Every structure is written in C-alpha cells, then in structure tokens.
Ligand binder design. Sequence first.
Ligand code: MG
Ligand code: MG
Ligand code: MG
Ligand code: MG
Ligand code: MG
Ligand code: MG
Ligand code: MG
Ligand code: MG
Ligand code: MG
Ligand code: MG
Ligand code: MG
Ligand code: MG
Lengths: 213, 159, 61, 293, 170
Amino acid sequence: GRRPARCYRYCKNKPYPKSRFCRGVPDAKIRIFDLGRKKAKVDEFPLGGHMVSDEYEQLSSEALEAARICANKYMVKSCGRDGFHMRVRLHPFHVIRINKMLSCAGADRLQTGMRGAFGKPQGTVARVHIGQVIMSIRTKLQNEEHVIEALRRAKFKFPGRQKIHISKKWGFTKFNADEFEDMVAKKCLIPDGCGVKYVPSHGPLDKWRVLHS
Amino acid sequence: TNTKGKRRGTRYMFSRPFRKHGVVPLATYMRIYKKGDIVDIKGMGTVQKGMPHKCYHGKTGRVYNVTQHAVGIVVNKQVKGKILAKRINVRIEHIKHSKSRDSFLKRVKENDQKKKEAKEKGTWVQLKRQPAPPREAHFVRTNGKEPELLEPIPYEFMA
Amino acid sequence: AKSKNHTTHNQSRKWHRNGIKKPRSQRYESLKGVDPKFLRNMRFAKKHNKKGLKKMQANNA
Amino acid sequence: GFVKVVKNKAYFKRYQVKFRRRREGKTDYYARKRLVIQDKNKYNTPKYRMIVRVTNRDIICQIAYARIEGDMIVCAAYAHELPKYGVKVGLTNYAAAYCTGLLLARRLLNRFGMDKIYEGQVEVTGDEYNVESIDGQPGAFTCYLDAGLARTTTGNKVFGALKGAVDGGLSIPHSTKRFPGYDSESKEFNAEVHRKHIMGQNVADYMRYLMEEDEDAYKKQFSQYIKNSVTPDMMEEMYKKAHAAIRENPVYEKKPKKEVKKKRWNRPKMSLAQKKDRVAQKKASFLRAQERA
Amino acid sequence: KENPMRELRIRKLCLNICVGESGDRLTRAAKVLEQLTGQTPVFSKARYTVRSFGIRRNEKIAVHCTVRGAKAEEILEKGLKVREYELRKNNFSDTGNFGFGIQEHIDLGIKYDPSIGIYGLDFYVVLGRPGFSIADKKRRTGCIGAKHRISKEEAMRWFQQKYDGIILPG
RNA sequence: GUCUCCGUAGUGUAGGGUAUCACGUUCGCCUAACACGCGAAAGGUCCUCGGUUCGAAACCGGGCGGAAACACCA
RNA sequence: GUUUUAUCCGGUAAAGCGAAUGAUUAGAGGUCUUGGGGCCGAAACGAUCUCAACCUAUUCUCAAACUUUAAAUGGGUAAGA
RNA sequence: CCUCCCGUGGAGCAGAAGGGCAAAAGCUCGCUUGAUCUUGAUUUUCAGUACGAAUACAGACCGUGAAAGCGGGGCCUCACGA
RNA sequence: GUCUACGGCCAUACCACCCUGAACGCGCCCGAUCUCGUCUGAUCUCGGAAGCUAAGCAGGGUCGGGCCUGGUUAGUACUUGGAUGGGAGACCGCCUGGGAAUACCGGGUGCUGUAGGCUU
Ligand SMILES: [Mg+2]
Ligand SMILES: [Mg+2]
Ligand SMILES: [Mg+2]
Ligand SMILES: [Mg+2]
Ligand SMILES: [Mg+2]
Ligand SMILES: [Mg+2]
Ligand SMILES: [Mg+2]
Ligand SMILES: [Mg+2]
Ligand SMILES: [Mg+2]
Ligand SMILES: [Mg+2]
Ligand SMILES: [Mg+2]
Ligand SMILES: [Mg+2]
C-alpha cells in the first residue's frame, strides 16, 4: 500500500518532523542503526569506508532498512559476524504525507477532489545532501575490498547516485589514520568504547597527572 | 487570513537579546530629549506601556513634543504609494538618540571652525567630502624577493 | 465560481507612476498634539512679549 | 553523584548576572528608578535626594542628583565628624541621626548661600515643621528621602535624619507617621516623646535604669560613656549645644595628608610567563616524583 | 590556636508535632508545645489534599515552634536525657545539623494532665557559627564560605564533646 | 469518507468528594435431597493516554474499538 | 524606483545541538537503589559476576510553528542658510 | 509536617499561544475603589471613515506610600456592536 | 596602594576551591529599657563597643568552568545581478559583487564618576 518512491524522491517541502504538531506518525521502517561488533575498540577496526550521496534527495526509511540488511548480510558472509561494524548515518526524521483518494468508481462519494487536500502522515524519509555520508563500515585493513563490495551492493537499494569512499580517518573517529598512532602515543587521544576522547592541553593539572601515571 | 492583532509577528522583534533580560538600565531614563532632535524607535518588550507599533520599529523620527515619560515623534510611514508623517507617542524606553545626527552636527561645527581658521590664515581648504578617488600611481618594491608562484591545488574528496 | 483572492502585482508600478512623494517638509510645523500646559504657557509668553520692547530696542541700539 | 549537576557548563553559559550593586545587595533598582529619574519635560533640572545610610558605627547623610556618568554628590555629612563639637560618644543613635541631618542641612544651605533666609526650626520640638519658600527670595531647597533597603517602620534613624534636615531648613516631603512619637493605635502623633528621642532621653533613661538594677551591666553597656563622663543629666544639654554649634559653624574643612610613601599592600597579578613557568615546574616535579617512585 | 569566632553553637531547635488531623487534638498539641517552651507555637496547614491520610488542603495539620538560646539549650538537654545521650550515625545531616524524635512528651519535665494527650514530637537542632546571619540579613547578604561551614563530622564531634554522647553506627 | 453517540462487577444496566440495582458466584440455614425461600459475604485501572482541578468514572482533548444516520443531480 | 559617506533596524539563508527547548544512535567509566538477580552468595548477596535505572565525559543524526552565533539582498534617517 | 543546602526561574502571572517579569509583573499581608468625573490629540484596521482596543497628555475628585511616585481596570497581544 | 557612601556601563565583573589582609572603614559581635516587629530580638527596629578578621568584603592563585576578544574553520557555507552555460532531471559549474557559524588553537579576567577617609 506504499506509493512508489518516485513520488517522494525530491526535497520539495520544508522539513516536517514528528513533533507536537505532526501527530499520528507511523513508526519508521528502520529501528536499528548500528550492526556488527559495536563493542569493538578503536584500534580493532582501523579501516573506514563511507557511502556518500551525490544528489540532494530524500531516502525512505524502508530503503535505508533494505540497504542495511543487504550490507549486513554481505559483511557477515565475507568478514564474519564479528569482523565489522556498520553505522547508518541517516535518520528518517522528515514525515511525508498522503492525500488519500477513494480507489472506487465514484467521485460523487464525498471525494471532494482537492478541497481540504492537506494529507495524513504516510511515512518517514531522511533528507540527504550532496557529499553526505549514508552508511559507514569500519573493519580490519585487509577487508577493504569486502567493504567496497558491500557498499556497492547496498547502492542498488537507493534512488540516486552514490559514491564509495575509503576515508582517511581512523575508524569512526574524526582523526587522520597517519596521525592517530602518535596522537595516542603522546596521549592526545584516550580510547573508550568505539571512540576516542580528545584530551586538550588545558584544564586542571589533576586531569593531566591522572594521565602519565 | 492574517489577524489584525497589534503584536502579531513581533515574537522576536519585541523579545530581549540573549542574557539581557531584567531591570532596564537607568541611563536610558536619564537621557535628555529636546524638541527637534532625531531619535531611533526600537521598542523593547520589557516595558509594555507606550510601546510603538511594529511598523515603527527600526524607523527614525524627529521629536516634536516632550511629556513626563514619553515623547511625540514625527516619523515617516509609507502606505501604498504615499508617505505620510505619522505622529506617535512613545515612552523613552523605546527610543534612543541618532548618532547620524550627532556626527552631522559635529561635522558642521568642525567645518565652521575650519572656515574661521582658514579665513584667519589665508590658505583655502577643502570642506566638501569627496567619494573615494581612484588610487594614485605608486611603486611596489620586491625587496629582493621573488613573488611566490601560486597554482591551483589538485582535487580530492574530503568528507 | 472561485477567483483570485489577493495580489500586490502591478501595485508598485501604479505607486511609482506618479512618484512616491515624501510629505512636504515646510517651516513652522503646527502645534497640534503638543502638551496643553506647555502650549498655554507659550501663549502667555507670546502675549506678554509686548512689554520689555523698550528694553529690547535699547539693547539693540 | 547521582543527581544532575545543576551548575553544569550550560547553566553558566546561559546565566545572566544581575547588576553589580544588586549582587552586592546595596541598591534597590526598583525604588531607584522611581526615586532618581526626572520628568522628561523638566529636561536637565536636577532631582535631589537625601541619602541616609545608618552603619554599624556611623551615619552617612548625603545629597545627590543622578547623572549618566554617575551620581553627583553636592553635600555630605557624617556622624564621625560630630566629635568635632559637642557630642563625641553614643553616635549612630537617633539623636546623632538628627544631628547629622541638621548638619547636612546647614552645610548645604551655607554652600548655597541661604542662611539668613530659611533658618529652619531653631527651637527644637518634635512637632511637624515644613519650611515655606519666601517670595522675593530664592526658593527653599527641595529633596526627597532615600532610605535604601532600610525597613521604614516608626522610629527609624533615617526619619531621625529627615527630621534633622527639615529642622535645618530643607523642604523634604514627609509625614509624622514614622516619627517615634506616633501612636499606631490612636493614629495620633505625640510630638513630645519624639523630642525626647531627638534629645536622646531614651538613652538617658536606659542609663539611669541600668544604674539602679545592675551596675556592672551598666558598665558593660555604656563603657565608653563612662570615659569623659557623659551623664544622663547633661545628655540633653550636650545635644542642645551640639545643635547650636552646628548652626554656628556648618562649614567642613578637609584634612591634608600627602607625605605618604607609595607602598603596595596587595599582591600584583601574575604574568602569563610566570603562570606558564609555574605549570612547567609542576609538571617537571611530578615527573621527577614518579621517576623517584 | 582556634579562632573564637569559629565556635559551634545551637542556632535554633525547631520543635514540631505533626498531628494527623485538626481540631481538639491539634489544640491540645499546641498546648503541649506552649507549656514545654513557655512560648506560643504556630499551626502548619496541609500543602495538598491526600485521601490516604485523610487531610485536605489548607487544613491545619501540625504545630511547631522554633526555640533559640538558653531555653533551646535546656530543652535539648532534656531531649537528650530522654534519648539517653545516644544518636544514630544517620541522625546527622550533611549540612551540619541534626535531630531526633521523642515518643512521649511527658518523660521530659512536663507532667501529665488528663486534658493533655501522650503527644510525641520532633527535635531538630540547627548548628551554627558566629557569622551565619549574613545569609539571612537584608542588606549586603552573602554566603558563609567553605571553611566557615559545618560538616557532619564537625557536628558529631561537637555532640561528643558537649553532650558526652554516643554515636551508634546505625 | 462526513456527522453523532457509546465503553462501569461475570451479565444487563444506573450514577467532581470512599460507585447503585437485579441476575449471577461463595457460605450458613430450611428439606430425605434439589429447587424455591431465609440470613450474610465477595466481586468492578469506571476502555487507554494527557490536561484543568486540592480532588476526575464524571469536565476537556488524543487514541483503541463498537453503534447509528448521510453517501444526491446529472 | 540611483549610488557614496555616516548611523540605526531585522532573525531569513547558512550554522548549532560535547549551548537552552524538543527529537534521536551507539558504545565507555562510575557508584546508591522495591531493576532483573546470582551460577557455591540465605548465614553480615560470607562474596562479587551480569543486566537495568541513575550520573559523568564522549558519540551518530535533526527542527516551518527551536536557538547561542549569523550573512547577501533589504527598510529608516542625515549629508546645512 | 518540621530543618538545612543547591536552585536564572526549569514555577506562577484566569484562559490559547507568543513575548515580558525575581528584594518582579509571582506569593502573603495592610489600606483602599484610578473599574470614578471631563475636553481634546494620537496609534492600531484604515479609505488614513467608523466601531472596538490602546498610547501620551491636560483639568477635577480621590486611593496608597515616609516619600519619590504609581493608579483613571486586569503585564502586553483578543474577549465585541450604527 | 586601597576602602566607605551613592552610582554609570552591567560576568574582562559570574561560579567553585585555596592563600593573604598594615591603618581607617565595612563587618561579624554584645544586649532588649525605649522605637518597632516576631512561633522565636533568628530577620526587622532600637541601645551599644568586650572580642574577632573565622566569615562577608578586598587583592592574588587555578595548564579551573564560564564570559570577553582574536586566529582557524574559510573566501568554505550562503548570497545580489548575468548567460540561447552543463545536465533527462536532481542539481551543479562559471561571470559580477558581498560573505558567515561550530569543533580546534591563542590572549584577557572589570573600567570608571562624585563625595569622604586610611596609608611617613
Ligand atoms: Mg503503479
Ligand atoms: Mg510543498
Ligand atoms: Mg483557474
Ligand atoms: Mg478579482
Ligand atoms: Mg521600598
Ligand atoms: Mg519570522
Ligand atoms: Mg536551516
Ligand atoms: Mg539540543
Ligand atoms: Mg489626572
Ligand atoms: Mg495596562
Ligand atoms: Mg578558563
Ligand atoms: Mg559568487
């Protein structure tokens, strides 16, 4: 009962979040955004590969769910269930509406046509810009081709054009891979979970002397 | 379909700036407004009495009448294809002096001083301010340094 | 049945055909709306300006 | 810690401090706006207020008008300059408040040159008195009381200072409801117990009351009264001749002092180089302590 | 060695009797407090209406009175005599003041009267130092400062040296 | 689709300040026994959520259902 | 129906959410509780293993009816007898 | 219920929402009727007509406060009729 | 070099903790006969001057938080005007002018008016 995605491909309206004004929104198709070994430490998965949209368009929650499932299945098949971590970087926050018409052989049956045409919430989509990351996969450095293939397969679930880019950052952090090692060595970075905490050279000296100890 | 309320659309216009709520500083009350001087109408929202209408916020007028707490201002308002000089009573919280007028009177006084001084000392001097002239000819020394060669950088996708 | 509701199309052109003229700034504005107490004292000062004319002309001379 | 830290970073980011004197708890700006702001159709006409501030050991009486750059004080009188003549002990009481208000009034009138006119009420009684401007002569000085944060109940020393000033010849609008002679039940002003308070007879009664019950308690309470032998019988005459001296010479002369060496009693602010060096030394010492282990 | 301006002392004692309902019982409890303190108490109304306790909003529920000075010292002495000079470790608040409860008001000084019940009550003594009134003054009010504050350890120490009591670890 | 109404013991229903009636259920009587009858008892987020109120089953909005009435001229 | 020089006015675009108000992803570190509990702990969970809630520092993604910050274009006034 | 501490307002201000507000505009007391009698001017919608509402004055008579002052209804934006 | 009274701007002034404070002062402090308020002289009001800088207060400190001001972000984002520019579109590039904001990295941490004191 869902319309084709070509009817909601473009970012034509203003953002329409589920709020205290827009009520009765059905739940989004995608509820899980992180898959694989999410508890893996930062140094475990040094390689990061992003999938980046080249179009300013709307991606539906069902499309995000399908792409996530496809990428997960290929990554589990190739690199094993604990050899990767995936993060979907798009959340379907924009509600798309439908002005429902009666699909019967009658316009006299209170169809009203375009009168009071403001629609009911049909679904949720995510707005993506040119250069915005849709999915990210971090894994071992030797699984680069597997990451590229998984993202290539996931591309087929989306309307527009997407590029696969192997980032220079270390894992899901915002720091370059070449500088990551010596930054951790000189304790500008402290690992925790899947991320690193940047430790600037300002603040109380008690925080400095709990380090170097 | 728009309402005709007196304060429709003034949600941010009459709101206070960030971290500037509370007591109105008293120099605003201590300002002196004579008849004929030029004031800017702003319209702070802490004081709800004597508030100007939203169409006069940001406008500038001339004081014609002074009362205990407010002033009477002749301010131009454009209505369709005509401009008419409205007279509004505005409490002194919502107005301030016009530095454009202040600078102009300073310039007039300084020009009169220059006229008197130059008539005393004979030599003619320029008083009409000119627009920015074209740049005159000048020499640019290299100081024995070759100017740096610039080239466009190669493209790479960053993020 | 239905028709156009509102527009300001062509209105600016109509406004500028005869020009949007500012009010005629002319010397000696009217004293309308001025504080009545101030106005009545001003009237008294104008009325009694007559006396002191001999002193005024003596100072002028 | 299991409760949200209320004073976190965002709390200070959005915190708006009050005015400095409001934070110091010295100025009531709600009362100040009504008290110091002149009507706009009066233009640059000054609005005079008589600030009265009773301190733990002093009374300060000032006359000021507000300006944009700050208050302009035209006349100040203090209770610590009372020992110059007559009264020297038992300051910061109602009688000293009357004396310093009278001194402020006489000093201001002398500076403005209005002494033969507006002599005020020379013969002190507690009854109400309001100076009237004399035609063909400069008008009486008009100012309004500034009590600050003091609770203005009946018998306040700020109203004692106001009574002193209005007896000195200052036109201050007031009523007798807050003078000590006022009876809150019958709504009637006695004007005699008020004069007793002005002459300090309540303190004299306390002295002679303590004498007849507990002599050592009297010593402890009026210890400095014993010095130079201030006694209840002569207290009223002392206050009367203090008033007479105020009327005779209200002019204040300043005290000169210039032979003072420039000595600094406060530590100066450290420099950025010094702070950086201190941080470096602390780091080096900590690493040294570790390597010693 | 120790500045005399830092000496701990009792600020107020704050007797409280929370009768469940209003009327004759509350009046008798007020009479109990007035006879104990030589001082008129005041009535406290219910903030909200709860059906479990059977009280209504703005209904006079409890009675209480704050006692300061030598009278506070004597009343605290009587209360600690009833408590046998022992207090639990948790009876002391982290702000440096403490309290306890007395089950029957007639075991401390006051004799029984047939028109008087068997009311219990709450003692809550507030400790202070010379200078705590700056937080309560009107003009130029301010906070007391970190070193001038009273800690739970300081309150327990003061209890031990003054009223030679026992701090039970409970 | 639009408009209107309803939701309360197991059942059918009444009803801003601790929820009624009848049947049903349990217990004890009467009878050889059952039924009738007699004497007692128990049994209900008052559909769900939020709000006004000191206090909501009630008053006001949203949702779950259920029930009616319209759904015409070509 | 113009620019320039002064001088005010504004809350859109953008940006922000380790800034308020709402929405929201995932780990990490702590220690109280009517969290589940937990394998040998009833015996003083002799113990301390996990999952909760909570707090703390981070982290992904957002807002027409959110916002610290904030354009371009624009609106007013002045540039003298 | 009583006590202390933190608390930039995360409460309250009749109601919709927005703005505004902390020795406030909120809460509690005390005294009161400026929610009174009048003439004009002005703002808002605007045709620069009216109504409604509102702002600043001026003249009386008052209320309150020690006083400066504030008050001719409700903190402002609605609550009405030839 | 500072303080007190009254302030102007209203954090470069706030917040947390620590150290120092000579002299005046400001305070803490002592008491309830009178004035005046309380459940309570705690607050308020009043009368004082034994003690104390413990606190307020002032100055300084913290690889402090905040705030203020810079750099970077970045001529990036966005944008006035133009084209018979590109592209199926979505959008993008160029010409003509204007031009931001986080994160990150520095510096600073009240200025001052009137009146009156102290500081050899
Ligand atoms: Mg089809
Ligand atoms: Mg649309
Ligand atoms: Mg058509
Ligand atoms: Mg038409
Ligand atoms: Mg006051
Ligand atoms: Mg807007
Ligand atoms: Mg935007
Ligand atoms: Mg946020
Ligand atoms: Mg009047
Ligand atoms: Mg009003
Ligand atoms: Mg810092
Ligand atoms: Mg451009």
